[PDB]
């Protein structure tokens, strides 16, 4: 019997979501199980749960981000530069690998979209415009990003059947951690500025592992390491949303822990 919107709202209330909250969801729809009207049922429940003064923030990225195609070059390679689609925030599909629910979030009426094509964030609520802009190339997840503003606004991270690697806000801890050997990446994104397509090349922190030892593709990254150590140590509201085991995490607290975690393990 598929979960109804009102059943999900009650479960979110049980978990500790309150009207007015600013929530960042990370969702496994397979863990959630069948929904009355598909993924939209959970989007609707999240919006009801946070109320008209609350907010939803999601890391949605872009299905067609030219990340690997431009990585490590000081300019987009010519064949990429000449034909890649410009990122059009109100028309760009979410990256499917960060959750199929994100395409439902970002197409929700009134949803806003940040201008960083690879780190793109989607936001719903009165603070959505303040959350999504600015989002400059060179500020993907650290200071001046939407995640930084989320962290300054008592954000809660809502993990709904998702693994400990799916805690994007921890990339803020990596950005500001005073440790040696931090990995950086250089890539190019095609933006729209006044309807004109403009290639921007930038460097930023490597979001696939802030240090070498965390960036092997067949091992856990720093986000997962930090998140597992935090969840092993911290009382966190836990309970079902649909069929999925869920956690409601204080975003400022886990990011503070992560900064401490990184700085304790690596010299300045
Ligand atoms: C759309 N462009 C993408 C580009 O943004 C970047 O995505 C990052 C992404 O992997 C990270 O998620 C995975 O991280 C790891 C360890 N590597 C294991 C499983 C995931 N939790 C996320 N935390 C931060 C993202 N920025 O690289 C891939 C890409 C497809 O090119």
Residue 42, CA distances (Å) to 53, 100, 163 in order: 18, 12, 18
Write out the two tokens for 52.
Answer: 């008209």
Distance CA 107, CA 92 (A): 10
Nearest-CA neighbor of 174 among 135, 214, 203? 214
H or E element in which residue 24 lies: strand 22-27
Let me know: does 242 contact 1? Beta carbons within 8 Å. no
* 152 close to 131: Cβ distance less than 8 angstroms: no
Q: Which residues fall within 8 angstroms of residue 53, CB to CB, at 6 or more apart?
A: 19, 20, 125, 126
Taking the alpha carbons of 212, 217, 219, 222 in that order, is the dihedral positive or negative?
Answer: positive
Ligand 1 atom closest to the Cα of residue 71 is 31
Tokens found for residue 112: 């806003």
Q: What span, in angstroms and rounded, lies between the C-alpha atoms of 207 and 200?
A: 18
Contact 209, 94 (CB under 8 A): no
Closest CA to 108 of 95, 89, 126, 122: 122
Q: Are 22 and 156 in contact (CB under 8 A)?
A: yes
Measured between alpha carbons, how far is 29 from 162 in angstroms, rounded to an integer?
A: 9
Using DSSP bridges, classify how beta strands 55-59 and 121-124 pair: parallel, antiparallel or unpaired: antiparallel
Nearest 5°: CA angle at 24, between 22 and 44?
Answer: 80
C-alpha–C-alpha distance, residues 136 and 115, integer Å: 7
CA distance 234 to 226: 12
Alpha-carbon span 153 to 151, nearest angstrom: 5
Residue with CA closest to ligand 1 atom 30: 67
* Residue 48: φ, ψ to 5°: -65, -40
Q: At what angle do helices 251-265 and 222-233 cross, to 10 degrees?
A: 110
Residue 82 to residue 41: CA distance in whole angstroms: 41
Nominal resolution (angstroms): 1.8
CA end-to-end span of the chain, whole Å? 54
Answer yes or no: are the C-beta atoms of 119 and 168 closer than 8 Å. no
Experimental technique of record: X-ray
How many angstroms from the chain centroid is the CA of residue 12?
Answer: 20
Which residue minimizes the CA distance to atom 18 of ligand 1? Answer: 165
Pocket of ligand 1 (CB under 6 A): 61, 65, 67-68, 95, 118, 165-166, 168, 207-208, 221, 223
Residue 263 main-chain phi, psi, to 5 deg: -70, -25
Shortest-distance Cα residue to atom 27 of ligand 1: 208
SS3 200: strand
């Amino acid at each position: 019997t598929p979960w109804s919107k009102s059943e999900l709202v009650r479960q979110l209330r049980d978990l500790g979501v309150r009207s007015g909250d600013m929530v960042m969801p990370h969702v496994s729809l397979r863990a959630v199980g069948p929904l009355a009207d598909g993924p939209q049922t959970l989007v609707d429940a999240l919006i009801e749960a946070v109320g008209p003064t609350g907010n939803i923030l999601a890391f949605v990225s872009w299905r067609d981000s030219p990340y690997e195609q431009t990585l490590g070059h000081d300019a987009p390679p010519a064949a990429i530069a000449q034909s890649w689609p410009a990122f059009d925030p109100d028309h760009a599909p979410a990256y499917p690998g960060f959750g199929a629910i994100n395409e439902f979030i970002r197409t929700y009426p009134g949803c806003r979209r940040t201008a960083h094509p690879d780190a793109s964030m989607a936001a719903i609520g009165p603070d959505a415009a303040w959350l999504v802009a600015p989002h400059e190339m060179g500020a993907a997840y650290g200071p001046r990003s939407p995640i930084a503003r989320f962290l300054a606004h008592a954000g809660k991270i809502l993990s709904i059947g998702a693994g400990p690697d799916a805690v994007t806000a921890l990339h803020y801890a990596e950005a500001v951690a005073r440790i040696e050997g931090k990995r950086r990446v250089t890539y190019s994104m095609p933006l729209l500025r006044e309807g004109k397509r403009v290639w921007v090349t930038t460097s930023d922190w490597d979001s696939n592992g802030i240090l070498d030892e965390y960036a092997a593709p067949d091992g856990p990254d720093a986000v997962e390491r930090i998140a597992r150590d935090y969840l092993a140590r911290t009382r966190v509201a836990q309970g079902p949303v649909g069929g999925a085991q869920s956690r409601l995490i204080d975003a400022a607290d886990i990011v503070s822990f992560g900064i401490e975690w990184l700085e304790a393990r690596h010299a300045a």
